[PDB]
């Protein structure tokens, strides 16, 4: 729910910059000369940078060799096959390259197998410059590197077609990371609607980095493989390390946890990595059932958690959510619902995004104003009307300025 606080930036800026540098009318000839009879050279452009070139498909040599018997005045004398083989099988790749780049209009979805083959990608990985550490990290995970790389058409020239290929570069490895989930929490007042609900919005990914923590709030854009996470810092917020205290304590003074409030109560569930959390409210039926022993437990009204040990399916109302089967150890921690510690009358109803401290301050101001108004209202009945301004020295009898005759 924290998607608006993110920054907005560009992704293909570097490729566009390289492509723009590749239009100086001399660079392309320099590349062609420097890759005259060898592959995978290192070149320096007029911009003063050092980039890596690579030739993957060669057609000038084969066409020059096999066109003379076909183009010359030989009356197109069919000779044998392996002329159709060596040609019909070749041009399909270029046809598909034009295919994808025409459909996508320039930048294409994750480099397709047709733009780059696995052997070509691995030979490029060796060619690419970087520390030896980042080889096994992204040589066993090509299927996920392909989804994190763009591809930009750049230019066509005399006899050369060249397109820039982005490739993600990994800087931080092996720091501890953790996922955070949330669930609705409400009271159970008998009168429908009168209840109050609060939730935490800090759900997402947390990763320690350089003494701070990077927080990713779009959990749909962070990939998981075995026990390793994979997503860029483009969608990250930088937070101080103390925010982790919100996990263990909810009223710590070092940092303020993020919550939101509402007055609508519904029953739902979330599927964690190793268990299922269920918030069951109202008269809707809730049931966690094994695949073999049938129903095993009925949840009462409120929030509850189940570990996947001996659990196969969960049902709330009419839905049905399965559960993961990873092997791990959970640990329930008992406690009391904090919602029991708030007065229903002065509770804030609607808050799109606020801190617990902000809610406490608003509540304090509210009841302070109420008490100030009631104490002043407690002084009502302690005031009389004003005597006439005509100079009469009357007396305050029966709350009125009557002529002084009771004791005079």
């Amino acid at each position, epitope marked *: 729910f924290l998607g608006f606080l993110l920054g907005v930036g560009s992704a293909i800026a570097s490729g566009v910059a390289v492509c723009k540098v590749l239009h100086l009318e001399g660079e392309v000839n320099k590349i062609k000369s420097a890759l005259l*009879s*060898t*592959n*995978k*050279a*290192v070149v320096s452009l007029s911009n003063g940078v050092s980039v890596l070139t690579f030739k993957v498909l060669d057609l000038k040599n084969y066409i020059d060799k096999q066109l003379l018997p076909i183009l010359n005045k030989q009356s197109c004398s069919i000779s044998n096959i392996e002329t159709v083989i060596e040609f019909q099988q070749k041009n399909n790749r270029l046809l598909e390259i034009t295919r994808e780049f025409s459909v996508n209009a320039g930048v294409t979805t994750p480099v397709s197998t047709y733009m780059l083959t696995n*052997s070509e990608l*691995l*030979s490029l990985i*060796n*060619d690419m*410059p*970087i*520390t*030896n*550490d980042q*080889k*096994k990290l992204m*040589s066993n995970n090509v299927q996920i590197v392909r989804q994190q790389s763009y591809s930009i058409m750049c230019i066509i020239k005399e006899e050369v077609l060249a397109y820039v290929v982005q490739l993600p570069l990994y800087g931080v*490895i*092996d720091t501890p990371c953790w996922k955070l989930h949330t669930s609705p929490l409400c009271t159970t007042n008998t009168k429908e609607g009168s209840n109050i609900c609060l939730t935490r919005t800090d759900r997402g990914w947390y990763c320690d980095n350089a003494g701070s923590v990077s927080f990713f709030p779009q959990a749909e854009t962070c990939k998981v493989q075995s026990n390793r996470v994979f997503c860029d810092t483009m969608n990250s917020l930088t937070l101080p390390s103390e925010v982790n205290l919100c996990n263990v304590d909810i009223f710590n003074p070092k940092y303020d946890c993020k919550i939101m409030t509402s007055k609508t109560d519904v029953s739902s569930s979330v599927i964690t990595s190793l268990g299922a959390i269920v918030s069951c409210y109202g008269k809707t039926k809730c049931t966690a059932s094994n695949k073999n022993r049938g129903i095993i437990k009925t949840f009462s009204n409120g929030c509850d958690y189940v570990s996947n040990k001996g659990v196969d399916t969960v049902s709330v109302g009419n839905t049905l959510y399965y559960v993961n089967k990873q092997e791990g150890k959970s640990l329930y921690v008992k406690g009391e619902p904090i919602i029991n510690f708030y007065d229903p009358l002065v509770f804030p109803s609607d808050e799109f995004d606020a801190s617990i401290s902000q809610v406490n301050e608003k509540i304090n101001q509210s009841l302070a104003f109420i008490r100030k108004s009631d104490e002043l209202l407690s002084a009502i009945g302690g005031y009389i009307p004003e005597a006439p301004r005509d100079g009469q020295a009357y007396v305050r009898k029966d709350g009125e300025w009557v002529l002084l005759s009771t004791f005079l």
Partner: antibody
Framework: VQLVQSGAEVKKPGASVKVSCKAS????????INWVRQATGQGLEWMGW????????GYAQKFQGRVTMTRQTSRSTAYMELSSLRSEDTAVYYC????????????WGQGTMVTVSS | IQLTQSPSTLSASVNDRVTLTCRAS??????LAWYQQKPGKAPKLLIY???SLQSGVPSRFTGSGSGTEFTLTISSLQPDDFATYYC????????FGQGTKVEI
């Protein structure tokens, strides 16, 4: 750039040895450390690599399960510990720096000879 | 991968152009390395990137080739060059090669 190795050491068969390599003249964590050995009258044989920035290690197949590479950033010094040393391991060991922008070993230490014998 | 120096040993005289070949058997990328190891000391960089000269070396040494064969060439043999030369790579692990000695 300079790399300094410890002096020659002698150990009994089956024992363990530890060779130190202290670096100077550059940023310690920006380059990877490699270990190579040369038997007398024989060609070079690569042993393994140990990245100082992350601490990850990669060992050759022929030496798997016997070698351990460690790091001390505060001293900027790497350590190679070889266990279960056999008679054939009598040779000289080098510690060298590999360069990420160039695929090559640019700096080599003086070398340390270790003799194993009953 | 397997590396092979087709010259195992070679001897010649002063002011000669000597050629050394190094061959592989798998996806070798296009990166080689030529080192010189003076006896009793540590080897040194001579050829990196398979075609680029290291700073400080005399220019008489050259290196070229692509595919499955790579050749190192000394244009003129000097008296102070009689030593051993080796071939390296980076398929995935690392691998040096048998190597040749330039005796006189």
């Amino acid at each position: 750039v300079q790399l300094v190795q410890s002096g020659a050491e002698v150990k009994k068969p089956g024992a363990s040895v530890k060779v130190s390599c202290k670096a100077s003249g550059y940023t310690f964590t920006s380059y990877d450390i490699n270990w190579v050995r040369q038997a007398t009258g024989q060609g070079l044989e690569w042993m393994g690599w140990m990245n100082p920035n992350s601490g990850n290690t990669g060992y050759a197949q022929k030496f798997q399960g016997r070698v351990t590479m460690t790091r001390q950033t505060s001293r900027s010094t790497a350590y190679m510990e070889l266990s279960s040393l056999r008679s054939e391991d009598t040779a000289v060991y080098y510690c060298a720096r590999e360069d990420w922008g160039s695929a090559a070993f640019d700096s080599w230490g003086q070398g340390t000879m270790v003799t194993v014998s009953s | 991968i397997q590396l092979t120096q087709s010259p195992s040993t070679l001897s010649a005289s002063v002011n000669d152009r000597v050629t050394l070949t190094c061959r592989a058997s798998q996806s070798i990328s296009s990166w080689l390395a030529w080192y010189q190891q003076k006896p009793g000391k540590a080897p040194k960089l001579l050829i990196y990137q398979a075609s680029s000269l290291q700073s400080g070396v005399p220019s008489r040494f050259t290196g070229s080739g692509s595919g499955t064969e790579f050749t190192l060439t000394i244009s003129s043999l000097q008296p102070d060059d009689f030593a051993t030369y080796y071939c390296q790579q980076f398929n995935s692990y690392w691998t040096f090669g048998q190597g040749t000695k330039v005796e006189i």
